[PDB]
Structure formats: C-alpha cells, structure tokens
Amino acid sequence: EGEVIHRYKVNGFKLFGLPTPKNNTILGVLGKNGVGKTTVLKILAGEIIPNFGDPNSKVGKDEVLKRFRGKEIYNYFKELYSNELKIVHKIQYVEYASKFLKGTVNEILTKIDERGKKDEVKELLNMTNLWNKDANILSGGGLQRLLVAASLLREADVYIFDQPSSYLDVRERMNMAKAIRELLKNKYVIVVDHDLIVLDYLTDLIHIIYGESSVYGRVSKSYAARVGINNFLKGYLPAENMKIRPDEIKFMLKLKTKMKWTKIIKKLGDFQLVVDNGEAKEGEIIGILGPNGIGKTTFARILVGEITADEGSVTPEKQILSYKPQRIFPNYDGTVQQYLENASKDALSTSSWFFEEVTKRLNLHRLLESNVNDLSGGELQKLYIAATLAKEADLYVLDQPSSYLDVEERYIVAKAIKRVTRERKAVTFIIDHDLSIHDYIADRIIVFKGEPEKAGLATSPVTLKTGMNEFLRELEVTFRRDAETGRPRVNKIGSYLDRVQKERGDYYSMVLST
Numbered sequence: 001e002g003e004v005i006h007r008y009k010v011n012g013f014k015l016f017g018l019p020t021p022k023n024n025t026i027l028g029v030l031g032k033n034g035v036g037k038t039t040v041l042k043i044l045a046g047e048i049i050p051n052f053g054d055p056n057s058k059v060g061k062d063e064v065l066k067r068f069r070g071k072e073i074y075n076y077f078k079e080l081y082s083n084e085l086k087i088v089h090k091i092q093y094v095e096y097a098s099k100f101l102k103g104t105v106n107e108i109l110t111k112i113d114e115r116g117k118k119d120e121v122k123e124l125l126n127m128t129n130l131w132n133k134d135a136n137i138l139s140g141g142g143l144q145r146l147l148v149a150a151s152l153l154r155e156a157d158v159y160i161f162d163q164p165s166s167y168l169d170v171r172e173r174m175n176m177a178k179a180i181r182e183l184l185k186n187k188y189v190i191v192v193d194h195d196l197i198v199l200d201y202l203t204d205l206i207h208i209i210y211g212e213s214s215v216y217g218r219v220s221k222s223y224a225a226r227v228g229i230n231n232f233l234k235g236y237l238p239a240e241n242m243k244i245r246p247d248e249i250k251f252m253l254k255l256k257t258k259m260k261w262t263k264i265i266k267k268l269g270d271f272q273l274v275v276d277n278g279e280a281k282e283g284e285i286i287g288i289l290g291p292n293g294i295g296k297t298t299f300a301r302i303l304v305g306e307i308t309a310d311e312g313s314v315t316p317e318k319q320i321l322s323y324k325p326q327r328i329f330p331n332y333d334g335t336v337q338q339y340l341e342n343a344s345k346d347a348l349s350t351s352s353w354f355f356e357e358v359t360k361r362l363n364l365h366r367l368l369e370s371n372v373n374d375l376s377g378g379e380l381q382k383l384y385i386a387a388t389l390a391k392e393a394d395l396y397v398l399d400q401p402s403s404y405l406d407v408e409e410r411y412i413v414a415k416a417i418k419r420v421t422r423e424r425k426a427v428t429f430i431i432d433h434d435l436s437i438h439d440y441i442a443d444r445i446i447v448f449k450g451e452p453e454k455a456g457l458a459t460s461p462v463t464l465k466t467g468m469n470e471f472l473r474e475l476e477v478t479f480r481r482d483a484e485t486g487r488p489r490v491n492k493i494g495s496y497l498d499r500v501q502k503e504r505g506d507y508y509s510m511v512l513s514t
C-alpha cells in the first residue's frame, strides 16, 4: 500500500519513498540489507531513473519531474536532471571499482585533485603507507580509503557514500568520519553505513529504511540524527507508527578465573608482538580492539594453538575451544544443514534455545538446502558464527565477526555471543572494529597499540572505561552516554562537550546526558 518509487522487475523488490537531500547537511541512511539503501542512493545520484513500479516502461526525466511536482524532492530532482548538480558517488562495491584503476595511489589522487586538498587527505586518512602502491594490488581497506580519498578531492555539489566503513579498521573508520565531516561543509552529503558510531559522528539527519529484505523497503521521514539512531535501537518509528524489530537494542543494563596467560611474545618476520599477562573469568567477554596489522589475529591464533608463542603460555594448556577465523572461505562440500548438524544437535532442533535465538535469528534456517559454496560473504559469516557458537566449549574466539554483516545482524550476533558465553560459563574473545559492539557486550577489553606491520603491544584485560579512555585519547575523540538509550555518543570535534571532557581527561564518559 502506498506509492511505489521503483521496482526492478514484476514480483521483485519494490521501494516506497525517497529521502530528500539537504544542502550543507549530512544525511544518514540506515537499515538492514536488501531493503533499497543502495537503490535510493543510485536514484539520488541519477544512475537509476525511478520507474514508479513499472519496470516495462521507460520513464523519462520529464515524467519523473511531473510526478514529483509540488513535493519536497522535486527541486533536487529538477537540479539533478537539468545537470546543475555535480555528483560524487563512492560506490558500495569497492572491489568492483578497482579493475578500472590505473597507476599508483599518489598519481590517481594527483590527477583528480580539483580542490587542492591532496596533502590534507593524505594526513587525515593516514595514507603515507599506500602512497606509492599500485591501485590494482590494493586490499579491501586500501581501496576503500583510496575511493573515499578520491571522493573528497573532487569538486562537486553532492557527495554520496555507500558503506564507507566496510574493510576499515576501528581507527580508520573514525578518521574517515572526521575527514568527511571536516572537508564537506556546505555540500549535500548522503551516507549509508552500518557502524552506528560512524553514523553518529557524521550525520545531522537520519532516515531509517525498513521492510523485508529483497521484498520491499520504505524510507521513514527525516529524524534528527540522535533521535533517528535511538528509534532504530528501540526498534520503533513513532511517525510511521512502525514496529521494525520485535526487541530493543539496549545499552548499559545490569566469579572464578577460567584461564590465565603470562606475557606472550611472538616474532613474525619484521613484526614483533607483545601481549601483557592477563586472565579471564567464567562467562566473561573480552573484546579486542586496535588498528589492522597490529597482531590481534596472531594473538587469536596463539590462543587456538594454530601458532606457537615464542615466549609465554596459557593455562590450562589444552581446553575445548571453538574458533571463528577472520578469513572466511567456503571449505565444505555439503549443505548449510549438514554443516550445522556436524557442529551441534542443538543448532537445528526447533526444541532448543539456540535455534530460535541464533540459528533462526540469523535467518540460517532459510538456507539449509544451500550448499556452503553457494553462500555470499554475509551468509558464510553467519554460518561460521552460528556453527562456532553452537559448539560446546571452554573458549570461544571470534575474529571480526561483524564483517559482511548489516546493522541488524551484528547486534543479533552480539547478543548471541553474550548468551552462549554466560550460559556455558565460558571465555570468549571477540576481535571487532565496531566500537558499539564492544560497548554493547564486552565485559573487559584488550587494546592493541603500535605500528601496523612493525610492532604491536597489547594491554592486559581492563575495564571498558579504562581501555576506551586511553584508546579514544590517541584518537582525539570523546564519548558520552545518550540520555534515552545509554548508547555511546561521540562529541563532534570542536563541540561544547568535546573540549571540556578533553581537559578532564574524561574521554570515555560514563555520565548520562553530557
């Protein structure tokens, strides 16, 4: 019911509504995958002409303008279609935007530097490492930084960023958010992202897109950024009168050592890793965070006996472990069902707590006939997370499980990790680059500091407060608690609370409504 903006094919996905871009404003778009976020951006960018639900018909620009006349969006579209707007679009699929890239990072950026901001962006996005590398040879994260950089250098009216936090480490995400905020004043900016802290930093306004993945999406009205993210956490949109999730994502709610490790040293070629002694309690979640190339995965690999430490040990030396590696690939002949059944009797019995909380809530129950090699990154991720979690263990290690996940699935996963760990009185280490995930479920954290590729030093497990304080300080940002949802809120650099908390040394504030 309502007015269809676009439909790709008969009986296919349909989109209802569009957000209006606003000048001198950063507009966030948020929702689970498969609901039309990328479609919305491509419409806004002028790459797709809305067909108003008829994929047979070739709608012209004139027709689109007649259909919008009187409405909020008309004027944007008039300017778009009358070629009065220069549009920059940092596309979602960065790996596809790679095979048309000739030359080094420096020379690509030098070619397109229209705003004389090359050197500025180099600094802001910390690109000196990438500087004389071939665009062709770049990893996910280097490509993402190169395209975001390239977008910042362009002189344009509208800048569109589809998921710029993908492949970025915790530090890079924050730098990218600072860079966009700083360099794109007095422009139309639209951003889609699944990292809530990135969105919170970047956005003035927020639209939620909700619906059923691959069936339909509807765009909410514009909310003030803070409110929009809060309604998303509550899972309720007041204006639309819409329960978009049956439960809420709540922050800040309310003995024996199961394992202990000495100082751990590991040298790999050039890179030296040092990890401080520590211990973990039964039921406890230790988040691990730090930039990439710093030894987090090496540390994971030491804990699972894949790599031997050069000095130091973990007691007890042999325990039942369950491991979700960072690098995920289809390595199995059989179905999702066969793979899950192999892992646990629980995982697929409609009878257990697991099936409904994890399996079903991950929507893995819909992929049972699929064989593992058919699955997308997102689906393999959930499959490996679910399998890992279904196994009865003393120790769980999950490496970057939020990669490939949308904004909903990461919190469903987060919740599950907590549930399994506490249920089974186990230790869980989770490495992740989404800071809200840590805030949401980590009981203590380990911070990795140093120089990517050369040296990493990791602290013992400390309180979120103790670790975040030191981590945020280096990163030069301050966090407070939102009054309504208790979610972390990042003070925009320069802001009222930002310089005061900075003087106090209170970078990670546990105070409500700061």
Ligand SMILES: Nc1ncnc2c1ncn2[C@@H]1O[C@H](COP(=O)(O)OP(=O)(O)O)[C@@H](O)[C@H]1O
Binding pocket: 008, 009, 012, 013, 032, 033, 034, 035, 036, 037, 038, 039, 040, 213, 214, 215
């Ligand atoms: N060219 C297309 N033809 C048919 N279906 C498409 C096409 N492009 C996207 N879709 C579908 O529309 C839905 C919404 O996709 P998209 O806008 O990319 O979602 P999101 O960005 O929110 O993940 C998904 O079903 C997607 O596969």
Ligand SMILES: Nc1ncnc2c1ncn2[C@@H]1O[C@H](COP(=O)(O)OP(=O)(O)O)[C@@H](O)[C@H]1O
Binding pocket: 268, 269, 271, 291, 292, 293, 294, 295, 296, 297, 298, 299, 452, 453, 454
């Ligand atoms: N087997 C290895 N041999 C030599 N160097 C390695 C090996 N495995 C990882 N490295 C290097 O060690 C550093 C630490 O990597 P890793 O533990 O993968 O970091 P993170 O998970 O923090 O990104 C990286 O620079 C990586 O290239």
Ligand SMILES: [Mg+2]
Binding pocket: 037, 038, 039, 092, 162
């Ligand atoms: Mg998309």
Ligand SMILES: [Mg+2]
Binding pocket: 296, 297, 298, 326
């Ligand atoms: Mg890693």
